Specification:
The complex is a heterotetramer of chains A (about 240), B (about 100), C (about 290) and D (about 200). Chain A has two domains: about 110 residues, Immunoglobulins (Immunoglobulin-like, Sandwich), CATH 2.60.40.10; about 130 residues, Immunoglobulin-like, CATH 2.60.40.10. Chain A is about 5% helix and about 50% strand. Chain A is built from two helices and 20 strands. Chain A is elongated, with a radius of gyration of 22 Å. Chain B has one domain: Immunoglobulins (Immunoglobulin-like, Sandwich). In chain B, strands 1, 2, 5, 6 and 7 form a five-stranded antiparallel sheet that branches. The radius of gyration of chain B is 14 Å and the shape is globular. Chain C has about 290 residues and is α+β, with helices and mostly antiparallel strands. In chain C, strands 4-3-2-1-5-6-7-8 form an eight-stranded antiparallel sheet. The two termini of chain C are about 45 Å apart. Chain D is an all-beta fold and about 200 residues long. In chain D, the strands form three sheets. In chain D, strands 2, 4, 5, 8, 9 and 10 form a six-stranded mixed sheet that branches. In chain D, strands 11, 12, 13, 14 and 15 form a five-stranded antiparallel sheet that branches. Classes of the chains: A mainly beta (about 240), B mainly beta (about 100), C alpha+beta (about 290), D mainly beta (about 200). Chains in contact: A-C, A-D, B-C, C-D. At the A-D interface, strand 5, strand 10, strand 12, helix 1 and strand 13 of A face strand 4, strand 8, strand 11, strand 12 and strand 14 of D. Bound molecules: ligand DB6, a molecule of 2 linked components (NAG-NAG) and 2-acetamido-2-deoxy-beta-D-glucopyranose (2 copies). The ligand CCCCC/C=C\C/C=C\CCCCCCCCCC(=O)N[C@@H](CO[C@H]1O[C@H](CO)[C@@H](O)[C@H](O)[C@H]1O)[C@H](O)[C@H](O)CCCCCCCCCCCCCC sits at the interface of chains C and D. Chain B: Belongs to the beta-2-microglobulin family. Chain B: Keywords: Disulfide bond, Immunity, Immunoglobulin domain, MHC I, Secreted, Signal. Chain B: GO terms for molecular function: protein homodimerization activity; structural molecule activity. Chain B: This is Beta-2-microglobulin.
Chain lengths: ~240, ~100, ~290, ~200
């Protein structure tokens, strides 16, 4: 019903950033909100019809554009650090209930030099856990990433799994007084399932980082949006 | 925008030296913002009462101003109206015979 | 009897507005609601009709919510205008009900924008009216999504109006049925013609008949002026006739009115009664 | 101008949740949203002031004399855990004004706790040792680390659906040469019969 793009963005201070929102519901109004953890949304700009824009509650730093009934853009001409936030688009007929887009996480940074992708490692179950409980817990650690925008998933024999998984609700700071991030996740299976050397276990970390049009000057691979994985086989 | 009509008239037969009530009735104007004064020999009368403003079937506004007065052979009474439709304040003198 | 509630709102700019209301039962005023007052004022002893105190306080609280919401709602809706926020803005509302026999009635709610009728409430919804500005279409669509407002308005027009008013008519019966007698008097001013004036003042109720007569012939050139109010809720009317000088002789002004119990007022030009009147009202014409 | 309460609420799977939203205007419409941290904003309920509620696990109601409405969650599940945001429109023309949200934590009923601290296998591509505190009851509190090069996570609940079995765990890791699993959760107050395998 309501889409947004890009899904994620990392920008530098002084840069120009454009967020786009799209809807083909035949809706009249469109809105831009920001959310800061945590957590009420605040209205930046909104619009009634093609080719007009109205200022919301916190319009400073932003412009809006409504080139057609379907599209509503938020423009940040000179990104500043205070604009690090999640942005939600929304639309409505008349009148009625507001439908929200999925959000865009924006991170504004002094420079891109401190952007790192995660390193990922899997740690295999304790044999003591196996004897005591007849269950087996795998642990995944995604460490050293910045900013803290990742999505971690488990894959068992090529298929994404939700059963038996939990992930830390949010990443922790590896140095709470500066700083990169870490995130853990567990996957628990039966001992007999873990003890099959044909069973395959993969922790996947989706990282949201730089795009291909970003300038990169560090001596190390450009930290683009990417997937990093680690894996283990069962062990009899 | 529409220009007010102004009518000035007494409550009772205009009998010299007998206490009476002078009415100033302003109609047919739009927008409703207006100032109305009633005058004795070119000087403003102070205890001028004002009806609540209302409007007609054609959406034009009207209001009635009135004051206690005693008519005389020589004393002059008048209603002075200021409205955006008219470049200058309009004064309508009370004419007994009209 | 036509019961009408009249609201006049002025919106000068983003930061200034004023709403004032008056209520009329036929030609007697029953309520006033000034912008500076938190509450509706009774202008008659019987203005509460047959409602209880807590019922009256409930109707009022309802309107107090309406007045604040109307103001905020308009201030948003003017952003939707053809050139945005085209201040100053005048909005008028005229709502109410015609009462018929025995207990039959028709309700209305009309809205004007800049002195022009643009919106009505009709059955269950708001409608623009032919010739309304095109930019009103979206505001009206939005307003029409509010079914809570629509249920309230329907209830006010269909039920609260005729019921409230049937009680006002009972409680106000002696004021509504009062008879006040016109007093008449004569004068003349220049037009080689003169203009004769018959002044009729202090009659209630409103309907009268005033003609210039020569014997039994009705002078067809009689111009009857407008009904002008007096401050005590009686009416004033003048009738005039253009005649060549030396013809006032023989003319009379006859006034018929319900309060006179079958005995008309007849004033003859030049009569002792007229002469004695004119003596009392002489002035310097400057 | 829109207030939610309580700011946080913890409860055990099975219990009903009631969440308040107080406001100081007229009520055109109330919209409740659900969100997991860093997640999308999901619409739960839209209730105009004139509409009839539609029965179900999730419902709302307005307080009688009062400018206040509640969200009602019947028979709370661990997956209801997240942030619930209230939004009020005061008329069809106003803005949607958002509360600051309630944090809801729905915790599992661990029938037979089996608190234990386990050391996991080393990874051939990492210098980290990892310790797992698991199977503890849901009122256990895991303390953050005191030491700088030691990392300890907060507890989460995993649900093994096929075995219909839930468990809490927390992870500690470090590359410090003097790190042992016997001492990794020393800042937490843990049950006296927590199993430390020899
Ligand atoms: C005898 C007593 C005399 C009273 C004297 C007052 C006025 C005299 C004359 C006319 C007034 C009659 C018009 C009354 C309309 C009654 C509407 C009442 C409903 C109202 O206040 N509704 C409120 C609150 O509503 C909220 O809160 C309600 C809970 O309180 C919920 O039920 C609703 O769901 C919720 O949305 C809404 O805010 C509503 O939008 C107010 C405005 C309604 C009138 C708009 C018509 C103007 C269109 C003009 C177009 C041209 C303009 C171009 C510039
Ligand atoms: C008409 O009455 C309204 C409502 O009482 C007044 O509105 C207030 O106006 C001031 C600005 O002068 C604002 O700060 C307040 O927020 C308003 N109060 C409310 C409850 O809306 C308005 O000023 C009055 N208009 C005039 C010309 O006196
Ligand atoms: C807005 O309107 C009123 C006109 O009566 C005026 O007194 C006030 O100064 C105006 N304000 C501005 C900011 O133009
Ligand atoms: C009010 O009256 C109109 C007819 O004039 C009708 O269509 C409408 O449904 C009525 N509503 C109620 C609540 O009585």
């Amino acid at each position: 019903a309501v889409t947004q793009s890009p899904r994620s963005k990392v920008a530098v201070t002084g840069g120009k950033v454009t967020l786009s929102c799209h809807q083909t519901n035949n809706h009249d109004y469109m809105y831009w909100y920001r959310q800061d953890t945590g957590h009420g949304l605040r209205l930046i700009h909104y619009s009634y019809v093609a080719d007009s824009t109205e200022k919301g509650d916190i319009p400073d730093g932003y412009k809006a554009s409504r080139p057609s009934q379907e599209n509503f853009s938020l423009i940040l001409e000179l990104a500043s650090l205070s604009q690090t936030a999640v942005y939600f688009c929304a639309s409505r007929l008349g009148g009625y209930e507001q439908y929200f887009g999925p959000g865009t996480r924006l991170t504004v940074l002094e420079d891109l030099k401190n952007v790192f992708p995660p390193e990922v490692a899997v740690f295999e179950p304790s044999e003591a856990e196996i004897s005591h409980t007849q269950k087996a817990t795998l642990v995944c650690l995604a460490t050293g990433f910045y900013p803290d925008h990742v999505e971690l998933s488990w894959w068992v024999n090529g298929k994404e799994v939700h059963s038996g998984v939990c992930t830390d609700p949010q990443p922790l700071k590896e140095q709470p007084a500066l700083s990169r991030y870490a995130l853990s996740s567990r996957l628990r299976v039966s001992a007999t399932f873990w003890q099959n050397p044909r069973n395959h276990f993969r922790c996947q970390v989706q990282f949201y980082g730089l795009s291909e049009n970003d300038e990169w000057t560090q001596d190390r691979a450009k930290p683009v949006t990417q997937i990093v994985s680690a894996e283990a086989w069962g062990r009899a | 925008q529409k220009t007010p009509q102004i009518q000035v008239y007494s409550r009772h037969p205009p009998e010299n030296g007998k206490p009476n009530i002078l009415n100033c009735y302003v109609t047919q104007f739009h927008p409703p913002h207006i100032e109305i004064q009633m005058l004795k020999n070119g000087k403003k009368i102070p205890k001028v009462e004002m009806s609540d403003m209302s409007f007609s079937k054609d959406w034009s506004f009207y209001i009635l101003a009135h004051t206690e007065f005693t008519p005389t052979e020589t004393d002059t009474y008048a209603c002075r109206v200021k409205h955006a439709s008219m470049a200058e304040p309009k004064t309508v003198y009370w004419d007994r015979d009209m | 009897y036509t019961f009408r509630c009249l609201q006049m709102s002025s919106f000068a700019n983003r930061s200034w507005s004023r709403t004032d209301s008056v209520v009329w039962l036929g030609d007697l005023q029953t309520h006033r609601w000034s912008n500076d007052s938190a509450t509706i004022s009774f202008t008659k002893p019987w203005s509460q009709g047959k409602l209880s105190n807590q019922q009256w306080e409930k109707l009022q609280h309802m309107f107090q919510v309406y007045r604040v919401s109307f103001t905020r709602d308009i201030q948003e809706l003017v952003k939707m205008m053809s050139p945005k926020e085209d201040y100053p803005i005048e909005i008028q509302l005229s709502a109410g009900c015609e009462m018929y026999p025995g207990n039959a009635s028709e309700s209305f709610l009309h809205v004007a924008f800049q002195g022009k009728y643009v919106v009505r409430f009709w059955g269950t919804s708001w409608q623009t009216v032919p010739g309304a500005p095109s930019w009103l279409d979206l505001p009206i669509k939005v307003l029409n999504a509010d079914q809570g407002t629509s249920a309230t308005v329907q209830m006010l027009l269909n039920d609260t109006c005729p019921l409230f008013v049937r009680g006002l008519l009972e409680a106000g019966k002696s004021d509504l049925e009062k008879q006040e007698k016109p007093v008449a008097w004569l004068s003349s001013v220049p037009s080689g013609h003169r203009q004769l004036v018959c002044h009729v003042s202090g009659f209630y109720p409103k309907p009268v008949w005033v003609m210039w007569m020569r014997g039994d012939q009705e002078q067809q050139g009689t111009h009857r002026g407008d009904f002008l109010p007096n401050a005590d809720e009686t009416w004033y009317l003048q009738a005039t006739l253009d005649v060549e000088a030396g013809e006032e002789a023989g003319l009379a002004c006859r006034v018929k009115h319900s309060s006179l119990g079958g005995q008309d007022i007849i004033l003859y030009w030049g009569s002792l009664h007229h002469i004695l009147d004119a003596q009392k009202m002489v002035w310097n014409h400057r | 101008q829109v207030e939610q309460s309580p700011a946080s609420l913890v409860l055990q799977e099975g219990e009903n949740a009631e969440l308040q939203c107080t406001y100081s205007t007229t009520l055109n419409s109330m919209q409740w949203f659900y969100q997991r941290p860093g997640g999308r904003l999901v619409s739960l309920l839209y209730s105009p002031s004139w509409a009839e509620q539609r029965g179900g696990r999730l419902t709302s109601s307005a307080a009688s004399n009062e400018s206040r409405s509640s969200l009602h969650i019947s028979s709370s599940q661990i997956t209801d855990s997240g942030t619930y945001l209230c939004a009020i429109a005061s008329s069809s023309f106003s803005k949607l004004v958002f509360g600051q949200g309630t944090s809801l934590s729905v915790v599992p009923n661990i029938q037979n706790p089996d608190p234990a601290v386990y050391q996991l296998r080393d990874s051939k591509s990492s210098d980290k040792s990892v310790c797992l505190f698991t199977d503890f009851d849901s009122q256990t509190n895991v303390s953050q680390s005191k030491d700088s090069d030691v990392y300890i996570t907060d507890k989460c609940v995993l649900d093994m659906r096929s075995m219909d079995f839930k468990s809490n765990s927390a992870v500690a890791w470090s590359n410090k040469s003097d790190f042992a699993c016997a001492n990794a959760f020393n800042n937490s107050i843990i049950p006296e019969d927590t199993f430390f395998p020899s």
